[PDB]
Design a protein around this ligand. Structure first.
Ligand SMILES: O[C@@H]1[C@@H](O)[C@H](O)OC[C@H]1O
Ligand SMILES: O[C@@H]1[C@@H](O)[C@H](O)OC[C@H]1O
Ligand SMILES: O[C@@H]1[C@@H](O)[C@H](O)OC[C@H]1O
Ligand SMILES: O[C@@H]1[C@@H](O)[C@H](O)OC[C@H]1O
Ligand SMILES: O[C@@H]1[C@@H](O)[C@H](O)OC[C@H]1O
Ligand SMILES: [Ca+2]
Ligand SMILES: [Ca+2]
Ligand SMILES: [Ca+2]
Ligand SMILES: [Cl-]
Ligand SMILES: [Cl-]
Ligand SMILES: [Cl-]
Ligand SMILES: [Cl-]
Ligand SMILES: [Zn+2]
Ligand SMILES: [Zn+2]
Ligand SMILES: [Zn+2]
Ligand SMILES: [Zn+2]
Ligand SMILES: [Zn+2]
Ligand SMILES: [Zn+2]
Ligand SMILES: [Zn+2]
Ligand SMILES: [Zn+2]
Length: 316
């Protein structure tokens, strides 16, 4: 809609207060004109029709419980936009400043969030397994990174390529969580998963085996569930990414950590320059080694650490 750019205030899913960019035209709308072609947040009104109605508010204050998922969907889309622009010089998910659209209150008791090819969709959860999923910055950034992957490498969502696709989304989801300094960790979804249970998450990048996911190629899942294990076998790549950043000794292989910024630069370059739709784990290793070589030199510590990390998880 056309109107005046304003700044409102509200509270997110976890009760935290934050400022959000709105647009004023009789009502205040969740329309952020300051980022690319805009960030737009919609109310799906517990239906499955998309996108729903552009979110309208009478007073530019978003403190009602019904508002909370919209506040966070809107705000964390903005943070994700800022991460890709300021850190990687990428303008929105398509690199051409496409508008980011999100719908909240999708369906009823819906325990999921997804990028559907043109927009973000957030369930409210059932209040036991999940609370509204836009409350997790790593979830928001994980799903938006699927859009980045679709517009670059085109990794297919099954078998090893699909596990790489998932891991890429976990890696950048976590780097956005650190970038925002929002209670950062190497877990996925901890802020919105099982509100009754402290200290758990959907999966761990630092210790995938904590939840039974593999942390070595010899332990990879080879069945047909989960599109061939895309959310299971991602643990192998997630552990490698954790080792590249933080270092450690894993199955007897010592890895010298090089930090989060260089992890992001290496994987972003691998994704945008070298990966293809059917890349497997071995080709990811080659792409990461080449990317580190491009950026830091063939004899650099950065290249050595990438090699060490993939050796540690058994990917040659
Ligand atoms: O913490 C990281 C920061 O150091 C780097 O600059 O960009 C990515 C962030 O995750
Ligand atoms: O050392 C930390 C590890 O114990 C934790 O699991 O994830 C973050 C790491 O830096
Ligand atoms: O030891 C772990 C166990 O606690 C969990 O239940 O399943 C996976 C194992 O790695
Ligand atoms: O069955 C597949 C297996 O062969 C591969 O190594 O990793 C992904 C699985 O889906
Ligand atoms: O680290 C182990 C490696 O040494 C062996 O060769 O294959 C299985 C791995 O667990
Ligand atoms: Ca209001
Ligand atoms: Ca997290
Ligand atoms: Ca929990
Ligand atoms: Cl560990
Ligand atoms: Cl471990
Ligand atoms: Cl470790
Ligand atoms: Cl270990
Ligand atoms: Zn998803
Ligand atoms: Zn995913
Ligand atoms: Zn966290
Ligand atoms: Zn798992
Ligand atoms: Zn899955
Ligand atoms: Zn998924
Ligand atoms: Zn280990
Ligand atoms: Zn470890």
């Amino acid at each position: 809609i056309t109107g005046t750019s304003t700044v409102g205030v509200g509270r997110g899913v976890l009760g935290d207060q934050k400022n959000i960019n709105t647009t004023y035209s009789t009502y205040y709308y969740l329309q952020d004109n300051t980022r690319g072609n805009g960030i737009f947040t919609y109310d799906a009104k517990y239906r499955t029709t998309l996108p729903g109605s552009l979110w309208a508010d009478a007073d530019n204050q978003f403190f009602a419980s019904y508002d909370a998922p919209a506040v966070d969907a809107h705000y964390y889309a903005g943070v994700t936009y800022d991460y890709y622009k300021n850190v990687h010089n990428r303008l929105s998910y398509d690199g051409n400043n496409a508008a980011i659209r999100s719908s909240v209150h999708y369906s009823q008791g819906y325990n999921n969030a997804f990028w559907n090819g043109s927009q973000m969709v957030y369930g409210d959860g059932d209040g036991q397994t999940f609370i509204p999923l836009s409350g997790g910055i790593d979830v928001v950034a994980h799903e938006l990174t699927h859009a980045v992957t679709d517009y670059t490498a085109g990794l297919i969502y099954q078998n090893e390529s699909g596990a790489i696709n998932e891991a890429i989304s976990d890696i950048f989801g976590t780097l956005v969580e650190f970038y925002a300094n929002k209670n950062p960790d190497w877990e996925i979804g901890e802020d919105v998963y099982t509100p009754g249970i402290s200290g758990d998450s959907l999966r761990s990048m630092s210790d995938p085996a904590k939840y039974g996911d593999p942390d070595h190629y010899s332990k990879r899942y080879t069945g047909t569930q989960d599109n061939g294990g895309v959310h299971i076998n991602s643990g192998i790549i997630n552990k490698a990414a954790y080792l590249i950043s933080q270092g450690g000794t894993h199955y007897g292989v010592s890895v010298v950590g090089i930090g989060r910024d260089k992890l992001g630069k290496i994987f972003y370059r691998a994704l945008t320059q070298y990966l293809t739709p059917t890349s497997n784990f071995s080709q990811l290793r080659a792409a990461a080694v080449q990317s580190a070589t491009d950026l830091y030199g063939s004899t650099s510590q950065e290249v050595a650490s990438v090699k060490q990390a993939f050796d540690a998880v058994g990917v040659k």
